[PDB]
Amino acid sequence: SKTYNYVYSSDPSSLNYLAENRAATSDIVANLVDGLLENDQYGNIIPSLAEDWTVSQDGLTYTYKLRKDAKWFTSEGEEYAPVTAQDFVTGLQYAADKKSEALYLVQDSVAGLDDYITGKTSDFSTVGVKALDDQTVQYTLVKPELYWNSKTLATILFPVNADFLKSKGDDFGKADPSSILYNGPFLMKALVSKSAIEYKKNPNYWDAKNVFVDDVKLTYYDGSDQESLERNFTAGAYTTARLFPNSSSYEGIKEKYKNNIIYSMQNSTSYFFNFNLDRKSYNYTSKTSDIEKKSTQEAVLNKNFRQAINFAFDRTSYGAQSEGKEGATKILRNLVVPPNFVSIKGKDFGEVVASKMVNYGKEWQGINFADGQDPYYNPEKAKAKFAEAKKELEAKGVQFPIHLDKTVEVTDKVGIQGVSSIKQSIESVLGSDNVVIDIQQLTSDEFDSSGYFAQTAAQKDYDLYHGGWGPDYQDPSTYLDIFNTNSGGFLQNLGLEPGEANDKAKAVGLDVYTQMLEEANKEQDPAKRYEKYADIQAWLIDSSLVLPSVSRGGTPSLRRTVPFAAAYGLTGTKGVESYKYLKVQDKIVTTDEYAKAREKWLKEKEESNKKAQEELAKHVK
């Protein structure tokens, strides 16, 4: 058989794909549970559990015909029940009943669902999901959504078996392979905290003919031995390896593999820095007084202060800590919405946003939001913004320097360097008598409990956070909605609770930002809708409530996977996250072999996306 071996870094808190919105869960369940549709190797949306589908001429009704060679299996591969249309009724009602953290995906989309969630109704029969028969699912939407079918690639629209739900009770979705049923490409054979995640190909999967690895082993990787990835690839143990140009070894590695180093493209995942606007936990701090803590709570609410940090943050220096100084810019991402995520009038998103910046002051004049460059770093602009921030803050009683807490795993040696680059950059521009980045090195438990796996905003224990967003569906709102005060998926990382809209949120204008998202969402013409979100992204950039840093991709690696064999998706969890369609080979791919395949793939992709948009009309009732 053929095996794919690599590493992972995030143990999941849960397998509950209906309740979670953390990538740590969806990345795994992508290989274990299928939804209505999935991706091919070119980003087209193709059949999955649903073998055919139609949309009504008004775009409000979506009907899906399910194949009937699709079944649920236990973790050991034993057949449990056939997949049926009722499973999608069960899935959506469950996510609603348990107040899923990804309800923003469907709450304002499925007819009557918002009424059901908020208690304005009690009868799920009024919610727009119906099992017409065992093979037929029908969704009724509030308004037309061209990106609706792309939403079915997110796990909150995945099916679940009601009898298994009843039989398991509160044990469903726990971090145990037996806590869920399986209908996707793989079974999960081992899930051991901080040790390994292991998949076995399900031979009775309905699309087993498209699964080309029989085993997938992911070994836990905590960052303390970065040479482990190349060392294991060279020994024949890993199918791939990400390289670290800053490393001791890279000189020898560079010469040994000079014809094999492959650079990926930047993808649609966007990382950015944010501040904690309502910090309540100080277990990890260097501040020793309450005047310091309150002075920091003040500074992060001041826009001039946030812009000073934004302009004092050297992204090239930051990227060089992980990519070497040659590839330092290859990962730079300068918006939350990627610059080419959508096109308006033939010009893409980043250009339009750069034009909307014209109404947000002198410090944005002629800005360029293209990937692969730093338009933000500007020391003298940072010094001017801080001078105004200090005049305004000192009148409030604020004491300087402003101390800002940033956490990092004590094992993450590359991350320690990146965070040290940020401390060095900001303190170099503004002066350590004005700002001090206090680096907090924590255990894995302290890092997760105060950051990514914290369950409340109050538990966030930092002043500065570095997080990221993966698009859930093909519309700019998947990114920009995450800071809205009603249901923002990222709000807690800012120290705010969705549905509370306290005065710190109003002090930075997030209520205004939220109001703009509401008006932008009502727009149904794509060109305007996108232009309205471009204006919103521009507002967010000027606010500097986020400091866009880097994307995924753009990194060097050695590979024994076949180029462009796996599925690809701009949004969702059925693209690179899935080990379906992926193929391994014996020979280390050469740089020239990958480039020839990329050129072939780029041409096949343009033709395939073309025929796919033409096929769409066949599906209208």
Binding site: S9, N21, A23, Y271, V414, Y452, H466, G467, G468, R552
Partner: peptide, 11 residues
């Protein structure tokens, strides 16, 4: 979906 920054150092 919420992405951890950690993953980018092996991805």
């Amino acid at each position: 979906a919420i992405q951890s920054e950690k993953a980018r150092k092996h991805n």
